[PDB]
Homo-oligomer: A and B are copies of this chain.
Amino acid sequence: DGRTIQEAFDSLPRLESFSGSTATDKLRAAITLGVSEVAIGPVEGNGGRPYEFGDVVIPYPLRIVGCGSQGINVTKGTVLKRSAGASFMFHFTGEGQAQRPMGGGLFNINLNGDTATALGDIIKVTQWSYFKANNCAFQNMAGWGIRLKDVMESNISGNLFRRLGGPSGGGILFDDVRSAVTDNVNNLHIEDNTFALMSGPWIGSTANSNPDLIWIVRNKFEFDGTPAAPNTVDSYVLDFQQLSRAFIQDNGFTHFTTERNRYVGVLRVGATAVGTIKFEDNLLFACESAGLIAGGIVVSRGNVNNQGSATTAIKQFTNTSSKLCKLERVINVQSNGNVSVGQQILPDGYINMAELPGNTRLPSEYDADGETTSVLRVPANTQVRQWSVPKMYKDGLTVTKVTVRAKGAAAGAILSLQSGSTVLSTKSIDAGVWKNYVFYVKANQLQETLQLRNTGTADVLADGMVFGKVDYIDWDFAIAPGTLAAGAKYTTPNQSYLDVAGMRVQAVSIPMFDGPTTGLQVWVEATSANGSFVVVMKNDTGSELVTTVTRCRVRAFVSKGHH
């Protein structure tokens, strides 16, 4: 002893070597002793061969430290191979534990499956928190690299994932929740990683996985080739049947195509997905499709695909989500720098109705002819949406206009534009077609908020709207000029600015009519300084003129007050 102070036999560097019979049977000698960190040394101390573990169960936050690195090659560093017919290599599980396991993981380790085809899992983590897998590899099997169930607060960064998955595998799997829907995968970082040459979902989640607050950022995903096990189904690199808050950002994705192992899209989001998925500022190369969004709130912006050697421009998300999606185009630039798919050219001032606030839950649905393909279904006697009027417009001197693109599901839908419960105007909605419905708000009618409501008896599908100030209002009114003797004239009823615009009328257009006014000399007389007017119609023919018109119309122009 007397090692200048302590004793010798200082197995503080608890390497695998101190334990028992064989590597895997040393197993719980490691674990039974409840040692905190175990060194695993390089492939030199096992004679060029990897240490071979199988079905090792870790019930406590055990650091397995290595002296390898992220990388495919197996000839330098710590290397670990799954055993002949074992289901997993390590199962870090707090199932049955009084206190939940918190910490531990895999540091500096090249982890392989026993064979390039062994279905199963490499590393399972169940009911655990603050697992880290750093500077590692996960490779060489046809099951899942890392399988996660009820794991929180965790980190998987700077690793390689390769030759993983197939028919019933993939990379990192968010499995079903363990018990309650809150026993999910949440607060997990997947960063700085490299994914390559894999089958199944590269990252995925099950139909009951309920994941939340997932970072998938600054990774590199690239096809690379087909592994031992090709895909049996149309596949997506990121396949999340459920997903809540998620950042999927600043990643590369390269060569994901149908012909290349059936990667028909980059991201797929299941119908039952909820929370906000940000798919933003990814740089793609020669990818076939952004993917399929069947559910959730998904925001996609800033993504750019260089088409490279691909035969076609990237296809945009197919969206059938029942929820607001804001899917800005994935820009397609050809390898020569030419844009062949640009930003979506929207109608000026277009707002998809799902982007507006409202007091009723209104599921979105797919319509091929909707501006964004996504439209609200609004049943009878139900608010569409209600929004705040800009403070610059509430000056008593601004006419505004709402144009809404709508389709009746059947006969009898009516849209009303309202200020609160006051009905401003109504439009009957034509069944079965998209049409633009125009509603003007006189300057004296505009208040704090506006709403559209279905006041009819059938469902209306609401696409989007344009709302804003206008500098004129159209006006049509009854006339009855009758039969005029030679030289006789008729003067229309007064058209008060109050009725026309709700505010001073600056001027009007020439008047037009619901029929020919042959032989009528027409002019306008102001009846007040505020732009009220009559139209005068004088028989200029020299003999009796039987007029036919019964309506007159103008465009009335509006500016401010009297100065």
Contacts and interface: CB of A to CB of B under 8 A. Distances in A.
A177 to B, nearest CB: 17
B350 A337 contact: no
Interface core residue of A332, A472, A554 (most chain B CB under 10 Å): A472
Nearest to A322: B337
Interface string A434-457: 111010000000000000000000
Contact of A13 (B13, B436, B510, B554): B13
Contacts of A283: 213, 245, 247, 275-276, 278
Interface in A71-89: 71-73, 75-78
A280 interface: yes
Contact of A392 (B71, B337, B436, B510): B436
Interface string A340-384: 111111111111001111111110000001110000000000000
Given A44-B34, A67-B37, A361 B348 contact: no
A126 interface: no
A72 B102 contact: yes
Nearest to A528: B516
A421 interface: no
Interface string A532-553: 0100101010000000010001
Interface string A506-518: 1111111111111
12 contacts: A5-B17, A13-B13, A62-B76, A187-B194, A247-B250, A297-B333, A339-B357, A340-B359, A345-B389, A392-B403, A508-B512, A509-B509
Given A215-B250, A345-B388, 18 more contacts: A6-B17, A12-B15, A12-B45, A63-B108, A73-B100, A245-B285, A296-B337, A338-B360, A342-B357, A474-B559, A505-B512, A506-B553, A507-B554, A510-B510, A512-B524, A517-B525, A523-B523, A555-B559
A361 B336 CA distance: 7
A153 interface: yes
Contacts of A349: 348
A554 to B, nearest CB: 6
Interface stretch (A114-122, A411-419, A463-471): A463-471
Contacts of A280: 281
One complex includes copies of this chain to the number of 3
Given A37-B42, A387-B345, A559-B474, A297 B337 contact: yes
Interface string A218-247: 101000000000000000000000001101
Interface stretch (A127-135, A163-171, A259-267): A127-135
Nearest to A388: B345
A184 interface: no
Contacts of A466: 392
A217 interface: yes
Contacts of A518: 525, 527
Contacts of A359: 340
A526 to B, nearest CB: 4
Interface residues of A, number: 183
A71 B130 contact: yes
A298 to B, nearest CB: 11
A347 B342 CA distance: 19
B343 A361 contact: no
Given A474-B506, A508-B512, A158 B158 contact: no
A77 B99 contact: no
A522 B520 contact: no
A513 B562 CA distance: 11
B337 A324 contact: yes
B34 A76 contact: yes
A202 to B, nearest CB: 15
B536 A515 contact: no
Contact of A506 (B135, B357, B523, B555): B555
A507 B556 CA distance: 10
A192 interface: yes
A525 B332 CA distance: 53
Given A153-B160, A512-B531, A405 B392 contact: yes
A255 interface: no
A519 B342 CA distance: 55
